[PDB]
């Protein structure tokens, strides 16, 4: 006996209200305990008042009783279950004994792995995309426009586009309205997008 394992004596053990009246350690495997039977005096009187004219039953005046929690599933005993399942190799006859207690019963165990089970879609998708960097390392990164005339003019074409917009043809096209207004300004060696362009500023070249 050890008081450290006794909830009554050890106040550090947090009682689970949802498991009141259920002791998994006391299960039989097979379970052969009766815990439910006829219950009266709660709403239906146990005595007889069918013909009592001076007594009228009022079910609304139900007295509150002890909460009956749903039965808790059995919890495994590691050592006992391992010993029960253990069989000696070349010392035991291959047979099934008459006793039904030899049946291998399933008992719920640790619940920590089920957290990972529940989070598996998040973990699996993170491994698939973020961990493996699929399809590439830039798709999931915060988008940044290229710097001014970077990497090459043939790709960026910021200066030529700026000159075209500032030219007569660019102004005429903007007046037509088919072409939207310019979205960046070429500052003193740097390209700055307008706040209405809805894009981040280009990353620094370092």
């Amino acid at each position: 006996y050890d008081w450290r394992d006794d909830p009554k004596v050890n106040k550090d053990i947090e009682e689970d209200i949802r498991d009141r009246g259920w002791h998994p350690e006391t299960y039989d495997f097979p379970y052969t305990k009766k815990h439910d039977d006829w219950v009266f005096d709660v709403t239906m009187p146990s005595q007889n008042y069918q013909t009592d004219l001076t007594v009228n039953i009022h079910p609304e005046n139900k007295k509150m009783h002890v909460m009956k929690q749903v039965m808790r599933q059995s919890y495994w005993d590691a050592e006992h279950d391992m010993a029960h399942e253990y069989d000696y190799e070349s010392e035991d006859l291959d047979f099934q004994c008459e006793s039904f207690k030899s049946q291998h019963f399933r008992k719920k165990g640790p619940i920590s792995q089920y957290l990972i089970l529940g989070l598996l879609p998040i973990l699996y998708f993170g491994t698939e995309f973020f961990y493996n960097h699929y399809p590439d390392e830039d798709y999931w990164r915060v988008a940044h426009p290229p710097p001014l005339d970077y990497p090459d003019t043939d790709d960026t074409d910021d200066t030529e586009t700026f000159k075209d917009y500032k030219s007569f043809t660019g102004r005429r096209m903007v007046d037509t309205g088919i072409v939207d207004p310019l979205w960046y300004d070429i500052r003193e060696g740097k390209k700055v997008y307008y706040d209405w362009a809805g894009v981040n500023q280009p990353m620094e070249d370092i």
């Binding site: 917009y165 030219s167 007569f168 043809t169 005429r172 096209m173 309205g177 072409v179 310019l182 979205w183």
Partner: protein, 51 residues
């Protein structure tokens, strides 16, 4: 429907429409043919069978 001399810059217009053309939420396929452009369209007559 007249072929007039262009006072603008055709290359500049082409580049501008390539880069920053104006689109809309409800734009018809006729005005949005991004992936439906070819050359030498096949011309057939109407109201007659062809094998």
């Amino acid at each position: 429907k007249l072929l007039k001399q262009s006072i603008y810059d055709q290359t500049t217009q082409y580049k501008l429409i390539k880069k920053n053309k104006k689109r809309g939420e409800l734009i018809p396929v006729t005005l949005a043919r991004r992936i439906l452009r070819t050359k030498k369209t096949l011309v057939l007559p109407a109201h007659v069978n062809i094998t």
